[PDB]
């Protein structure tokens, strides 16, 4: 019996006859590019991605964010070609290129990258780290405005907090300094949220630092809704995520239900849901800044648990499922002598009646 | 008479676990004499071309592109002699893991 194909076959387009006059590639890397291009297409047969979770394939993510800046395509292209021509006109650059001795302004390159295409890379890194899935579960935003966060770990020592960095709780004990370009006519809110680390509710998150009605860039001048709390990841479960969400708002938002008391050392009170927060205040604020770092347990987390939270430090461990063994047989045929040791409760000798 | 030695038992070279079967680690998914099924994710290859699951999960069979090892001279020659629009395809057997890697359990409050 035979069954008709349920769609186009892969190699049914090219002609079988007259192979000599048909062009061929002679390059393994060229074939590799072709094969990786083919492997990403939605074939009608069973594929690896379908079974191993392509995440429902394409998804129409809801964009809740600032519109992209409007630039003149023709003018931008003209200036870019002019810059390329003026660079190529040089001869010292040519000599350096041929002699393979030429350096790069890394700081500059980072500056223009963050200016023009940094938000998209940051958004895809947030997608990979799963921030949107746990903060809104259905929405994505592009961090249009850079947000530079830095902790002070000494008198001249500054720890930057990039997207996905690893920061020690000892380094993050103090409140950080945050900078972002903004005119003196807008209002901003900053939220530090602990995504993973809530002992009770898996789907909930903790608050650490909520400042609202920030005039432009001076965050210290704006009122703080939630006092800063240093990260306290558990000893067992490591590498928690802490996200800095920046919202730009038009009106002066005033609320009383989200306000926290001065001590604010109760984990029951410090229970948060960014989805609920954005649903409550969705009309005014729009997310425009993102800064998230990973954080693991260190020697200061126990002090934070004891002195501040006034509790006992919880300790976890990464346990593994017990090894699988088949049903024990009355007569295990051709099995090693150690077969009886696979079903032994303890390595001690029990004398039932003696 | 003139023909001798034609008697020899079958080697049972075939498929052991089909699609959807729940296998454990080390289970022989399929044995073969020549390369008929290729291993994929969480499927290891023995010295005798047999395929064994490396993780406990569900067996799946897929059709996927074939990029050979660049050190394999015969396969590289076949690829370089393939025409422009031709891509090789092979039947790969995969094991989709079911149980998680582990769990974080509380042991003591210190």
């Amino acid at each position: 019996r035979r069954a008709a194909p349920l769609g186009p076959m892969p190699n049914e387009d090219i002609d079988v006859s007259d192979l000599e006059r048909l062009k061929k590639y002679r390059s393994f890397d060229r074939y590799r590019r072709r094969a990786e291009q083919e492997a990403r297409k939605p074939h009608w047969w069973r594929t690896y991605r379908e079974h191993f979770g392509e995440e429902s394939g394409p998804k129409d993510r809801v964009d809740i964010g600032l519109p992209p800046p409007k630039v003149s395509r023709t003018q931008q292209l003209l200036e870019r070609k002019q810059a390329l021509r003026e660079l190529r006109a040089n001869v010292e650059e040519e000599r350096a290129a041929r002699l393979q001795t030429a350096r790069i302004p890394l700081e500059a390159v980072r500056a223009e990258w963050e200016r023009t295409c940094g938000p998209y890379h940051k958004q895809r890194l947030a997608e990979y780290c799963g921030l949107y899935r746990d903060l809104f579960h259905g929405a994505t935003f592009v961090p249009r405005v850079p947000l530079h966060v830095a902790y002070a770990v000494g008198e001249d020592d500054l720890m930057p907090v990039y997207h996905g960095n690893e920061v020690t709780p000892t380094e993050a004990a103090q409140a950080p300094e945050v900078t972002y370009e903004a005119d003196e006519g807008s209002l901003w809110t900053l939220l530090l949220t602990n995504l993973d680390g809530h002992l009770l509710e898996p789907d909930a998150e903790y608050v650490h630092w909520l400042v609202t009605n920030i005039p432009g860039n001076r965050v210290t001048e704006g009122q703080e809704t939630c006092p800063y709390l240093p990260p306290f990841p558990a000893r067992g479960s490591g590498f928690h995520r802490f996200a800095f969400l920046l919202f730009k708002q038009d009106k002066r938002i005033d609320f009383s239900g989200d306000t926290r008391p001065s001590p604010c050392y109760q984990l029951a009170q410090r229970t948060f849901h960014t989805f609920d927060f954005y649903k409550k205040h969705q009309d005014a604020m729009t997310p425009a800044g993102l800064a998230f770092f990973q954080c693991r347990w260190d020697d200061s987390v126990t002090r934070v648990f004891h002195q501040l939270l006034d509790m006992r430090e919880p300790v976890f461990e990464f346990v593994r499922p017990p090894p699988y063994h088949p049903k024990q047989k009355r007569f295990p045929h051709r099995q090693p002598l150690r077969y009886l040791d696979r079903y032994r409760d303890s390595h001690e000798p029990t004398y039932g009646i003696y | 008479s003139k023909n001798l030695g034609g008697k020899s038992p079958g080697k049972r070279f075939g498929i052991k676990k089909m699609e959807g079967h729940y296998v454990h680690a080390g289970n022989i998914l399929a044995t073969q004499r020549h390369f008929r099924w290729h291993p994929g994710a969480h499927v290891g290859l023995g010295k005798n071309k047999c395929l064994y699951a490396l993780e406990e999960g569900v067996v799946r069979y897929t059709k996927e592109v074939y990029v050979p090892n660049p050190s394999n001279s015969e396969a590289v020659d076949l690829v370089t002699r393939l025409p422009q629009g031709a891509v090789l395809y092979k039947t790969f057997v995969h094991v989709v893991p079911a149980k998680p890697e582990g769990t974080f359990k509380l042991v003591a409050m210190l």
Partner: peptide, 21 residues
């Protein structure tokens, strides 16, 4: 498999040949 719609997906000997008046 012969009875499946995906039979012959792995065929490649018709793409390469390896065996004037």
């Amino acid at each position: 498999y012969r009875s499946k719609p995906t039979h012959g997906i792995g065929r490649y000997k018709h793409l390469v040949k390896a065996q004037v008046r």
